[PDB]
Amino acid sequence: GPIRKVLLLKEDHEGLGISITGGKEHGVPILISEIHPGQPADRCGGLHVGDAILAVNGVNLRDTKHKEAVTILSQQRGEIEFEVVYV
Amino acid sequence: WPTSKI
């Protein structure tokens, strides 16, 4: 599908509300496998199961290993911009 | 593949 830019708002006491799978060591993108109900990703409205996360806050995630992506993603705070695509 | 909640 089309590449989308999506804004997510979260407070410091919560996580993103996403489960991710995949990663470069597996030859696949960082993929959203769950959106946890009522948490920031669900509330933001524009992120969905099956989305590949291509970048976050200008940080490219297309060739990142799983744990690299976890560190990068969990570091982001407040108003967070995602670039995503559903295939 | 591994899965992490974040």
Numbering used by the authors:
A (entry chain A): 284 to 370
B (entry chain C): 5 to 10
Text of the article:
In previous work, we have investigated the binding preferences of a PDZ domain that is known to interact with the C-terminus of the cystic fibrosis transmembrane conductance regulator (CFTR). The CFTR-associated ligand (CAL) controls the apical membrane half-life of CFTR and is a validated therapeutic target for the disease cystic fibrosis. We have previously described a peptide array-based approach that enabled us to design a selective inhibitor for the CAL PDZ (CALP) domain. The result was iCAL36, a decameric peptide with sequence ANSRWPTSII.
For proof-of-principle studies, we chose to further diversify the position with the highest baseline affinity, i.e., P−1 in , by introducing three halogenated substituents. Thus, our initial set of ligands enables us to test the feasibility of affinity modification by preparing and screening a larger library of chemically-modified peptides. At the P−1 position, we coupled trifluoroacetic acid, 4-fluorobenzoic acid, or 4-bromobenzoic acid to the side-chain terminal amino group, as illustrated in Figure 5A. All three peptides reveal modestly enhanced binding affinity. To explore the stereochemistry of these interactions, we also solved the complex structures of CALP bound to each of these three peptides. The modified lysine and the terminal moieties are oriented similarly in the complexes with and with the additional P−1 substituted peptides. Furthermore, the distal functional groups overlap with the surface on CALP contacted by the acetyl group of the P−3 lysine in. Thus, S−1 and S−3 can intersect and could potentially be bridged using a cyclic peptide, a strategy previously employed in targeting PSD-95. In addition, the substituents increase the contact surface area of the modified P−1 lysine residue by 69, 32, and 40 Å2, respectively. The P−1-substituted peptides are the four highest-affinity ligands, and rank-order switches are found largely within experimental uncertainties. A limited set of four organic acid modifications of the iCAL36 P−1 side chain revealed modest enhancements of affinity.
